[PDB]
């Protein structure tokens, strides 16, 4: 595994969203692990759906809360999800109405990086592409983070809250970090991004529920 990969500098990554005042962040992750994936199988980049997936994920929460797996689970179970155009997004729930002929990628499963493990996480994003993330967001140092490594003592890896991706991983002058996209618009943080300190006792338990979809 390399020392740096940015994913963004390879054509994997869509540009930022914003989800707006619906706790849908764990689509937004879903959405950009498969977007990664449709890149490395197709050569194309296009956004999915994030609103398929809440609507449609029976095994999640829509607006509140939902897990990345279950939203690989659907995908591969329905045999497809939908482009953002053919379903776009409203961040609100509504019942679902998936169109067959707007789908624009598939999934056939997924898998976990083992627990904890950030040595995992980093061969998984070396040799997969980007991969999908559970932290600890729930401090306000977080909400408003500018730019520079991320880290906080006070971040709790046994509280995981928030759903983003990490679309790779670094060292920004002598400090560790990973390169997290975020769905609160371009204009939270560096331009939608965060970077989070990687090799610092897992913090805000970044390697703690991380997961990527086959395809
Ligand atoms: C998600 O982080 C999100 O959408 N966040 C933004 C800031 C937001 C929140 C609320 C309104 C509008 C925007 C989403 C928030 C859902 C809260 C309503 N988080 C999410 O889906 O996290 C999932 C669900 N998890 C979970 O239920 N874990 C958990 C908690 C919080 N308490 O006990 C447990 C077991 C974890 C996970 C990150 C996978």
Same mark, same amino acid.
């Given at each position: ?22 706790? @849908?962040?764990? !689509?937004?992750?879903? *959405? =950009?692990?498969? $977007? ?5 199988? %197709? &050569? #194309? ?37 939908? @482009?953002?155009? !053919?379903?776009?997004? *409203? =961040?609100?729930? $509504? ?5 067959? %002929? &707007? #789908? ?44 520079? *490594?991320?880290?906080? $003592? ?62």
């Amino acid at each position: 595994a390399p020392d740096s990969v940015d994913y963004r500098k390879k054509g994997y990554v869509t540009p930022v969203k914003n989800q707006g005042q619906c706790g @849908s962040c764990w !689509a937004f992750s879903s *959405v =950009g692990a498969l $977007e990664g994936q449709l890149k490395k199988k %197709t &050569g #194309k980049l296009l956004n999915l759906s994030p609103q398929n997936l809440v609507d449609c994920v029976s095994e999640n929460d829509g607006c509140g809360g939902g897990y990345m797996t279950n939203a690989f689970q659907y995908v591969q179970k329905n045999r497809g999800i939908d @482009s953002e155009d !053919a379903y776009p997004y *409203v =961040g609100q729930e $509504e019942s679902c109405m998936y169109n067959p %002929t &707007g #789908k624009a990628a598939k999934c056939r499963g997924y898998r976990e990086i083992p627990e904890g493990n950030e040595k995992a996480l980093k061969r998984a994003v070396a040799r997969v592409g980007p991969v999908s993330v559970a932290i600890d967001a729930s401090l306000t140092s977080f909400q408003f983070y500018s730019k520079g *490594v991320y880290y906080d $003592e006070s971040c709790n890896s046994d509280n995981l809250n928030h759903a983003v991706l990490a679309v790779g991983y670094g060292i920004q002058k002598g400090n560790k970090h990973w390169i997290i996209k975020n769905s609160w618009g371009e204009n939270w943080g560096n331009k939608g991004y965060i970077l989070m300190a990687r090799n610092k006792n897992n913090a805000c338990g970044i390697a703690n529920l991380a997961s990527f979809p086959k395809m």
